[PDB]
Design a protein around this ligand. Sequence first.
Ligand SMILES: CC(=O)N[C@@H](Cc1ccccc1)C(=O)O
Ligand SMILES: CC(=O)N[C@@H](Cc1ccccc1)C(=O)O
Ligand SMILES: CC(=O)N[C@@H](Cc1ccccc1)C(=O)O
Ligand SMILES: CC(=O)N[C@@H](Cc1ccccc1)C(=O)O
Ligand SMILES: CC(=O)N[C@@H](Cc1ccccc1)C(=O)O
Ligand SMILES: CC(=O)N[C@@H](Cc1ccccc1)C(=O)O
Ligand SMILES: CC(=O)N[C@@H](Cc1ccccc1)C(=O)O
Ligand SMILES: CC(=O)N[C@@H](Cc1ccccc1)C(=O)O
Ligand SMILES: [Mg+2]
Ligand SMILES: [Mg+2]
Ligand SMILES: [Mg+2]
Ligand SMILES: [Mg+2]
Lengths: 367, 367, 368, 367
Amino acid sequence: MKLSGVELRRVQMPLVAPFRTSFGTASVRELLLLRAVTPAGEGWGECVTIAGPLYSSEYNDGAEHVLRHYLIPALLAAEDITAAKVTPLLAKFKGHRMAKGALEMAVLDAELRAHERSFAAELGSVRDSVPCGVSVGIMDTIPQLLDVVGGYLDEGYVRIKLKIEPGWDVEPVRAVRERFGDDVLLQVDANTAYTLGDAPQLARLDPFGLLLIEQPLEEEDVLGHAELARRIQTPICLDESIVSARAAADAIKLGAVQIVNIKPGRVGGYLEARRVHDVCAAHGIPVWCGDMIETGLGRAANVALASLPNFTLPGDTSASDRYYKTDITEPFVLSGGHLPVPTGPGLGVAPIPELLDEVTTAKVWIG
Amino acid sequence: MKLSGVELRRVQMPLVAPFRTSFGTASVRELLLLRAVTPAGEGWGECVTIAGPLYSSEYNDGAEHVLRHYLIPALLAAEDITAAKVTPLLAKFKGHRMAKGALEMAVLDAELRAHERSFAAELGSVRDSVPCGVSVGIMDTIPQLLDVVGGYLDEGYVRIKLKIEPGWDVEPVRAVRERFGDDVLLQVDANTAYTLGDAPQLARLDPFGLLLIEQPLEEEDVLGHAELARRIQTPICLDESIVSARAAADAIKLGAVQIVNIKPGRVGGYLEARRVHDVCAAHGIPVWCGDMIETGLGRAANVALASLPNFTLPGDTSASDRYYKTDITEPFVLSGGHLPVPTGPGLGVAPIPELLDEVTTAKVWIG
Amino acid sequence: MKLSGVELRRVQMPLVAPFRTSFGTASVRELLLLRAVTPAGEGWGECVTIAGPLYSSEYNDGAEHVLRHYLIPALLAAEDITAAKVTPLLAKFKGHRMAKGALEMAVLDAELRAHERSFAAELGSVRDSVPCGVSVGIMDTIPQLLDVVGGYLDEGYVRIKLKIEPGWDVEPVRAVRERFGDDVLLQVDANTAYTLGDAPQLARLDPFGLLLIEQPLEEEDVLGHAELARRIQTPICLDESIVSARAAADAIKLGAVQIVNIKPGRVGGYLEARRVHDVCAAHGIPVWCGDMIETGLGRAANVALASLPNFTLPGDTSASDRYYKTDITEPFVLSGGHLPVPTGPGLGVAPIPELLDEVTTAKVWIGS
Amino acid sequence: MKLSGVELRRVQMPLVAPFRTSFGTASVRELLLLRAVTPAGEGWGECVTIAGPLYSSEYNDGAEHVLRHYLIPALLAAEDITAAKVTPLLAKFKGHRMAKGALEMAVLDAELRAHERSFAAELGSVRDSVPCGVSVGIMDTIPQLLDVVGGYLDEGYVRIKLKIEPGWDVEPVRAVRERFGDDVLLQVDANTAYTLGDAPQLARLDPFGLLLIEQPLEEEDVLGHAELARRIQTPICLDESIVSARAAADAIKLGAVQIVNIKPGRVGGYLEARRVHDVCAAHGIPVWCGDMIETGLGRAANVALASLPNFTLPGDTSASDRYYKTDITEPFVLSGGHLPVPTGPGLGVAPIPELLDEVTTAKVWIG
Ligand SMILES: CC(=O)N[C@@H](Cc1ccccc1)C(=O)O
Ligand SMILES: CC(=O)N[C@@H](Cc1ccccc1)C(=O)O
Ligand SMILES: CC(=O)N[C@@H](Cc1ccccc1)C(=O)O
Ligand SMILES: CC(=O)N[C@@H](Cc1ccccc1)C(=O)O
Ligand SMILES: CC(=O)N[C@@H](Cc1ccccc1)C(=O)O
Ligand SMILES: CC(=O)N[C@@H](Cc1ccccc1)C(=O)O
Ligand SMILES: CC(=O)N[C@@H](Cc1ccccc1)C(=O)O
Ligand SMILES: CC(=O)N[C@@H](Cc1ccccc1)C(=O)O
Ligand SMILES: [Mg+2]
Ligand SMILES: [Mg+2]
Ligand SMILES: [Mg+2]
Ligand SMILES: [Mg+2]
């Protein structure tokens, strides 16, 4: 595969409802899409960065910059190229995992389309559909939360994840437990908002039987998570900290984690994500698929990834309409709490050009 | 892919020279080959069992029996089949890894041929050729060893591995070191022939600067290998003990291993072998590709596997003519101490039917 | 003595009731018997393999094959043989523990009959009878389970062991506890059906005061069992994982086990079983005797084994009639919840030839 | 067996040469023999106590007393008796292991004679002869030591063990090494004579390549031995400390021992000794057979014991004439450095009544 060039698009899509997290609130999703062009044809990738460096150090303008002036040129200068070779070709560049991952996705989609092979087949899928949960944001009042939660249970979502932060943890959890009972699969996610000094407050979650607490402490504090685990009954899950398969292995060896959230972009691609899955499986650590409010492109890849054998807890890969009135691909629709795994070549979906154009803010060709 | 049936062949091929190991001597290679037939076309697999249970519990008649009456029927009874799905379809059968691996290889070869994709591309190859060492057997006299070794260094093999056993360890190593010097990459392999009580004898290998000692103790004695490592300077490498990715992770956590030999058949296939590679990479453990004196079918798959990024020590995948005057495939030929990675669809090689018939002792169709 | 030869028999015996486990269901027991012939006399051994490799990698056709073409010829080729020497003579062959154990049993039985000595005396028995529990399979409905359990408590079995699997764990246990109370000795056995990810489901068994959970995870996952132990209150017992005395020592050192199930065939014979017992005793680990639905030959040997001092929990060595209408030997009959330890030479029992012939499906002689 | 009674004999036998140890010197062996009488017939046992409590707390008069007033009556009062049941029948009496062991030996010899079975068969012998070393005492001068050692090497003993103590360690070892070379198997035995404060002195034995140092510290100081092992290169072997299989397991778990000396009387019998062997084997710890200057009765039982599979270092079971001009049984005679394993029923030997009467100093019947 000689790479001819890449099209970078900025896209802006309105959200059905504001999504609030410990780091801020969003009414819109701003993202980067990549169209890799080969002599064979096209492949699509999606960057999971957001507008500013509030979740991790990467952000949309930074990703666009590093892709345009370093990563894409390094691939255009090479002669062969395969999805596997992207990693060594870009290894000299430190970090920028979300950007590398987006690029690897587009290359992989082009490569697999050319062999008429699905993402699911390449990654090692063993099922045709996957059970889906939903991530629910911080709200202004308890009764507004109970409404939203009740709504998603009614749609048939099999698990609820609540965003939490200081001032919004024990009360929402108690309320959800009182209203909906102890059989609902329930977990929480802090996005780094606590310190080890807040252990006694997080220990107040012990009686509610949560599946897990996701990333209570900061990204770099792996040892702190192992300390925290000695003080609370709720199992620790890491997200922000798991930047690679090596990072997962390290965290596991140190007793810092019992369940891992896998997000392809965060780890530098679908291929590294597979390795994270394999490392966790080998240590008996369950994994589940995270979501970065992707369009249908990323959603299609994630649903494929989530059909691997060690994904044994429900993921955040919700139906398109949880986030968007109008997706840019044919949308994902919940059915019996599950999403179906795509079947065509590559991602098994492509942007509907009319819908994509409506939401494109900017476009540039790199050749 | 619906699987139509499988052809089981017994094959017997003479060896250029007797090959002696701590468990016995062979002048011939007896093996099983599989031809998986689909509507799409064919795929080939090779079983790495030997005639009796002297290296592991599996052996040729046992593999033929379990394939024929359990493994193959379970795949024929399934609706849709993929290489990835072979594992869960056969999971209810305990052990029989070499047999399962052979069957998975044939299915994978058929699947990939149909997508016009190489084993190298599927596994994640990052190089076009690989450096090759050679495994050298136990001999009757030191001077006969020095001859053979000198011969293989002359052909351009980049590393020597010596089979060892009680009564044939320190002397052969000292002799090779006195005659060829300290810069030759040199290692040893015991195939389980020692006990922890022999530590003082194995410590006598400390001054010769060996890369490793492969499987000094029995397959089940992982804790003993960790104990042995506290007593000798030579790094421990495991082979027989590494039956899966989980087994590699367990050995590594216990300090029982510093370098891992990967053999696809021993671990239940090329897809598990890839997971062993990934688990070892994530812990910083170098791997290298083993050899089971395969025909060109297995040799092609191994050379592909050995081109993955964490294979950072030379493998035992020697040229065809190290073992055979006449291979059943287009032979592998050493060139600058390297073998080239195959490029066509699937294995990138197939049996030359006239050569295969000369060496086939038996044949049966399962349908 | 020189071994003259060995007779291999395939035997099929119907079960009184279907027996369901996490790995399948059986209405019949298919097994291998061995008759070792020496100048001194005959001895009997029993292989505990089943028809396919669903419990371990070994199975009946595989055991027959490896016995016939490797194990038995290696013993015929030797000069002098004792039960103890069987292990080194067969050491070059990797695995095949059940097959080796069957052959050792037959050689030992012949050796001990010639010295007019019981299995019990050879192994180090300290009691004349042993308390017996029962292993109860998975059923289609909770009320059918309660009926069967109630029946076995009525016969005087001192302990109940329930087979479990995903979808059949917390409910059957709760039901048995509700119907029969908290004083019944109760345990469960998964035969490898769970993963470490199922720890929260297995932790739901915490309030029911089980003695143990046997082999919740796969055979090779010893470190995982140590991890599981830190997450559940029910003590872990290993079965499939304990393939030798070295394996038991390793599991114990890693905190992966608190109680060990000993099955002689699984460990490569009665002599290795004794060593497992002794290693466990030295580390303070209780053991108990497992059952593989053996005929009266294996049952006799197991009852003997179970009379050793560190067998301090009731075993699965149930009475013959729990499994079989007609045993091929003098049957074992429960009495005050106990089975008596056999007293004659060797096993202390032998097949009744007419009963054995009714049930024999194939027979072959292997000699030098 | 109902036990009818036991005959206790005191015996005194002169030694060919004085035997000096860190705890004293002996020119004579004073011991207890037991003759257990059943309806079936007789069996013999031997107590390995010495005259005073200088090696352990047990001694001849103490053993005679405890046997006569506690142990033997407890067995006479029992209804059925087997060698295995001795242990539970005597369990209420604390300690007195050498005494219990002597009684168990006699009962076992009677039981096995009645079944026409050898000690070797009962214990699990896998060889017909065993290699033998010799234990050499402390001497007044270095040149006298070199003579005695040279003599025993000339007879074909395969290993030398030197008794040592403060003032007699480094010099004798150096001298033996300078005279006879580095290939002689050489070890030392301190019988508890050092403290952890003498570690720098014991570290001066590092360069002489000793197989082991036996019981450098006191019986109770198991943790101290583990400390000492961190400070010297010579492997630690325990003798006095290994009072049971449980003790061996404890010592091994604490890193206090690499090699174990088994003495049946010290551990409370041949049946516990077999358990010590099995425990050590399971942990990969080599064992070897000790000697307490027994008569041919004990010697016969020890040679049988030493033929078990994990006895992988030569024992102290020397030929009868190393200690005695005239043994009370048919004597053990070295042959190619080996002693042959007895073959008859029970011990395979019995006292020659005229020789026994010559050396009997006292006799009593307990009935
Ligand atoms: C899509 C986007 O970049 N929004 C916000 C922050 C944000 C994103 C996603 C969820 C919550 C807040 C920003 O950084 O300005
Ligand atoms: C569904 C969700 O909460 N996704 C992110 C939050 C997030 C949304 C959008 C962009 C970045 C982060 C997480 O799992 O933390
Ligand atoms: C042809 C063959 O498999 N021979 C040996 C095995 C063997 C293979 C390779 C090297 C040495 C021995 C046997 O007796 O089973
Ligand atoms: C090339 C070689 O030495 N292979 C095996 C030994 C072996 C050869 C042939 C068949 C089976 C095993 C090893 O790596 O240990
Ligand atoms: C007789 C036999 O081995 N039957 C089952 C297995 C089985 C044995 C014991 C209990 C349940 C199932 C089979 O392999 O099909
Ligand atoms: C009585 C019983 O449950 N035995 C086996 C199951 C089993 C029965 C028969 C043959 C093989 C396995 C166990 O404890 O796992
Ligand atoms: C004869 C005797 O038991 N003498 C010494 C001990 C002894 C035995 C063996 C070797 C040295 C001293 C004593 O107890 O005083
Ligand atoms: C032969 C020898 O050195 N035996 C004892 C010493 C000893 C001899 C005789 C009686 C008691 C102890 C030991 O190994 O420590
Ligand atoms: Mg998070
Ligand atoms: Mg090897
Ligand atoms: Mg079980
Ligand atoms: Mg001593």
